[PDB]
């Protein structure tokens, strides 16, 4: 679920999901179109595609269970949707962590008109 994903992001990166990742670039928060602005934005692009692979799941509301094994994120067995949603979120949180080095505040609240074109998953 969205709130769960948000806590995973905070635990991983030390940034609050809102507002750090909720309106970043072309794809973070309300992704949709255009060339991703940077690596972090690409993490959201891929996450969007990841959710897109699950058209009969409900990532915003469906809660999955996971644990931290030392620092490792380990998705625990739930429903198929939950498992798949968890893997999507786990990947995004790791991706955000791996790209904190290039995260740029200038992309927060990035305006829609600067995001044009369809990029295929």
């Amino acid at each position: 679920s969205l709130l769960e994903f948000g806590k995973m992001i905070l635990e991983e990166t030390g940034k609050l999901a809102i507002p750090s990742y909720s309106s970043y670039g072309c794809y973070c928060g309300w992704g949709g179109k255009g060339t991703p602005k940077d690596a972090t934005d690409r993490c959201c692009f891929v996450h969007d595609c990841c959710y897109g692979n699950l058209p009969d799941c409900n990532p915003k509301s469906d809660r999955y269970k996971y644990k931290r094994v030392n620092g490792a994120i380990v998705c625990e067995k739930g429903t198929s949707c939950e498992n798949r949603i968890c893997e999507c979120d786990k990947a995004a949180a790791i991706c955000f962590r791996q790209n904190l080095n290039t995260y740029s505040k200038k992309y927060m609240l990035y305006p829609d008109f600067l995001c044009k074109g369809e990029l295929k998953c």
Binding site: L3, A17, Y21, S22
Partner: peptide
């Protein structure tokens, strides 16, 4: 705040 990734 419930929405936004």
């Amino acid at each position: 705040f419930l929405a936004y990734k």
